[PDB]
Amino acid sequence: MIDVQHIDHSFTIGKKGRENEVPVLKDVSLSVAKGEIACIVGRSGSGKSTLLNLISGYISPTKGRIVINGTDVTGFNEKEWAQFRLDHFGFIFQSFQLIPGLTTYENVEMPLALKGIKPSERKQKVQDMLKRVGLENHAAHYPNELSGGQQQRVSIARALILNPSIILADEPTGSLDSETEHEVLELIQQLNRERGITFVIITHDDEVASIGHSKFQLHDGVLKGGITVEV
Amino acid sequence: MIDVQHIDHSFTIGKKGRENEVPVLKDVSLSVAKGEIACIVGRSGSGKSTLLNLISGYISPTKGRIVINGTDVTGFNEKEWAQFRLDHFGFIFQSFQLIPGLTTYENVEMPLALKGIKPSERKQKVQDMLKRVGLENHAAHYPNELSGGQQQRVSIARALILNPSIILADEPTGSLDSETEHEVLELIQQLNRERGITFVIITHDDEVASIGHSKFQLHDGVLKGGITVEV
Amino acid sequence: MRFKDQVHFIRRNMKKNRLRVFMTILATTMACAFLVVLSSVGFGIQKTITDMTMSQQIVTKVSVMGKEGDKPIKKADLEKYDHVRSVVERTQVYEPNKATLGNRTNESSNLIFTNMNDELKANMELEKGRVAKSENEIVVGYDFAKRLLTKKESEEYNKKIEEAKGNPEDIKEPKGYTKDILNKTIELSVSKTDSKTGDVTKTKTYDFKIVGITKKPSQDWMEDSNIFISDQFKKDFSEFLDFKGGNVETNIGVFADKFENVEQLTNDLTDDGYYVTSVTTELEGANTFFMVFKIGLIFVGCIAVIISAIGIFNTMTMAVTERTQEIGIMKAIGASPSIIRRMFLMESAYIGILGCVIGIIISYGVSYLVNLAVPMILAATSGGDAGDLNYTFSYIPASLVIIAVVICGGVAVISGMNPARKATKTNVLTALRREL
Amino acid sequence: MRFKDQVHFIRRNMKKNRLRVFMTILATTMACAFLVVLSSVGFGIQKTITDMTMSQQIVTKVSVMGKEGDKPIKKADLEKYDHVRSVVERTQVYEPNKATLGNRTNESSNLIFTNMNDELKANMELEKGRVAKSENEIVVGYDFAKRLLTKKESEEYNKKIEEAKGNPEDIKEPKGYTKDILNKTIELSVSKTDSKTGDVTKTKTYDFKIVGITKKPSQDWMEDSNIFISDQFKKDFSEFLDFKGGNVETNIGVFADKFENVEQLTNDLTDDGYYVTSVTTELEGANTFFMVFKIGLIFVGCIAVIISAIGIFNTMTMAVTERTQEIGIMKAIGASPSIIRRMFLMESAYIGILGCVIGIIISYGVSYLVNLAVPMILAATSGGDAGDLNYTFSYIPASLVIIAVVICGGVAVISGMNPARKATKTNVLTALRREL
Q1: Which of A88, B68, B230, D90 has a CA that sits 20 to 30 A from residue D186's CA?
Q2: Which residues lie closer than 8 Å to C61 by C-beta, 6 or more apart?
Q3: What is the set of domains in chain B, with CATH numbers?
């Protein structure tokens, strides 16, 4: 479960004598339960990005508290929040974040190495997950030698390698074609329908948002339209 | 006034044990008159880019000879090719190829610094060149703080500031808006109208090519339909 | 993240820039070799001075010449300490001496008073003869033939020396005595200097049996023509040839069984403090000066090692800048600050440790080259064949290797500390948004 | 490209990485300061040895023993040499002197008779009086009054020296005469020794008036109280006080111009076969070792400089790789490979030369600190005046500054040569297009 309520954030930009504070989040009340695809719909820089940053753990929110899996994360320092991200989080960032260089197999295995999984178990998990996603027939294929759709697919495979409760994503199809958009979206839908996994996908497209179990439209920094309309 | 008679070039890409010579040029006979916008429209890898890199001086042709302003440039080494590019060439590359940092005034003055023009006349030269292009109210504005259109305009300004005779260009609207493309092409038209200068623009399209005084189509490398199309 | 994964990541990232990390490793290797070689110059100076001290004189001497306060220095109060092997007592005699055997007279001779029992418990190097425990038995010095020249030979040698003045030219004479130095029962000019002061009374000359001869002295250049008069005869010698006092220089030895026993005897000072000139007392000041010299050379090398440390920091900030994307998405995954700091501190420590190991091997090679070339250079330059002596101008003990490893690993880790903090504080948001 | 334009471009590309540029400049600074200080240790050893030699001996006294084959050395030929001031023909006869001026007397007063025209024309030591010209007239030294003292004082002096017993600490006797010696009638009674050997024939009555005083004796050395006699008595001195066979010792000075002229005269005389010895003789004897030591210390500084130049090379390779795009665009415009190579060689040499300049400043400071510390540590043993020993590091980097600048600039250029070639060999096509 994800519990976000009365959360606000402000950004200070400029020199010490030119500290300009522009609040973005205004008492966000995002509430997601286990095993549904939540979604945040808003314009570019409207406030979805900062909300995803706070929910992931990159920025500590200024006020309010955030609870994931029944545990308070606002007071987490960098070490504890990173430990939480290791074992209970996954990431599908838009830029595909695929380590320019290296290989697909090692890109997928990277979070296993970070957590500390033993080698043969790592091999088994990577092979099984790459088989599940569908990019198993590439092995040591460098990310630069893949297309953007395959980059998104291998990023998803990396996210699923530690079977986390939440695999909250940025816009997974921000730079993607419509066909690859539909493919990635149905892949994520099948993820939820196979294994109960919370999603906090943030996008500026409502068609991408349509697959979710909940709608959360953020207009100019304040959330609204929080419903659970069945698709 | 450019003469490219019987020029061919092959890309020898691969390892020493994995040599693969793929010819991209097939004995082109391109001819360009003085004070006209020669447009060479082709496709990605067809030979437009290779032909521009060959005529510019980055690539020495394997066979044939090239006469530029009544000067053979086939056997030229790096030093003399660069000197030629300095005193008689100009460049409008697609990405605008502007130095990060290096404020737009200094960015325009850069080729004068390369040639060795004293700063006293340099200041005035950059001033009227920026005024003619239409970016004189920028002064110390970084290129990264500009838009794509004005970046292309300041690239043109850097091209004209040395008063060259050939200003061969890559796609000047490769990353541009429709309005910015229209105004930059109109700028090129007024440029050739007011000051005698030769353009060797290569485009991946035809609407930009229609501005040119001549059409040269590169279907995989072979020139067809080379006529002086009056504008 | 365990250790194998961290090593794999470090190797993968270092493989990206081979010509840069190899140059950093070369700079560190040259600095470690520099530090070890320069400090080993001082270490070898200390080792060769210690070896020269051991070779020049007896390893176990413990001389107590120069008693303060004019208090008695009699042997009767000198025997009771910890495992003192010998309390040999010496009183040199300044008398005119010349071997009264034919025309050959041994003008140069240094009579030494000793009991042969104290000699046996002192283990002085003896070439011939078991013991001379008798009133009329002596042991002659090793150079008893070279200094036993005839009167005409000595006169002509002195005249030839005067011809060449004070210049030490090739002026040489045969080695005097050529017959056997076996048991002959010969007498050597016990003629009095008025017992010891100034007048020369009745000559008188005891007949002493030559039981044996002494071995080669502690050094080749210095000669030895001792007589080794028995201490049982010392009572009558004092009674008749009263020399006690100044024509008398006490050379009492406190020789112990071994060098560690010399060290413990030196520790047992402040009661037998008779101005001891033992090897340990003399070498304490040398050890202090050598500690200062080795510390100075260690610091001088440490300067050149800090230069390579600065180079390591440069290449490590270079690596952090190049690895910003990988670190950023690793932090996004949850790599934790501790793991990334450990990874980058380990990359810096690996650069430093590999440089130190390669530089220590190179330093062993350079020290071998120096130890082989220095005797050759000494032989060639100053026309002396290096004196046919053994020197160690460059010695690298295991201690010096330990200091080198510690110092170079420490400076490498210190250099990597700031890039490690930079790589932990990546601000993942920036690295996850690329650039413009 | 104008030089100002290249400087501006270097400023632009150096402001990008202020920390890395400052760190490689600091590595170069430490290497240059290390080189300068280490070689300055040897330069100061050479300077202090040279200063000690120049202070303990008179610089211009080019003493010549003679010629090969014991050929006599005439006075006339020595004059006709290069840039000779004048030749000294001082003659000394080993014999005690019994001056006995009135109730006073002198003992050593060894004879220094010689033709004074040449000596005083050879910048001889004197401050008052006139050269000895008349038959009964001599030139006296400064310490004459020190030994001049009444008969009772002479008995006291004799008692003091007899009771001294070889202890020259309680021998502080009063000076005695503290008045003017000039214009007196000293009844000199130089002792005879049967001309030379042993019998004492008859001491002449050298009733010579006192006109002429010598100043303080050279540079705090030599005793000048000895009486100086002119050439007017040479005939009767050779007739009566015959000295030729033995006792005579006519030291020859050969005074000349400044020290470089002294060295030139020394080598000119050596080329003729003379037995030349002077300050420059010992200086050249130690100069081979000093040159070897300076070269070795400069080579140690050179390996430190190479340690820093590897860091400079890393910084410059990362500067070439880091931009590659300003370089690509300049090459596209036509900046020429020569201009780019000069640009990057200028940047590397600027890092090296700034590091060398501030290393020279820091090494001047460190040498000053060493000059303030070495006497402060080693006092109470030999640095009583404290203006000696290591009081040398003020001038030391005279040619050492030039050598250090040349070495560091050149090695920086070598280190930056490869990055310069990399920059001039950047493919324009690859450099222009972005790398995603």
Answers
A1: D90
A2: C253, C255, C277, C278, C279
A3: 1-79+194-231 (3.40.50.300)
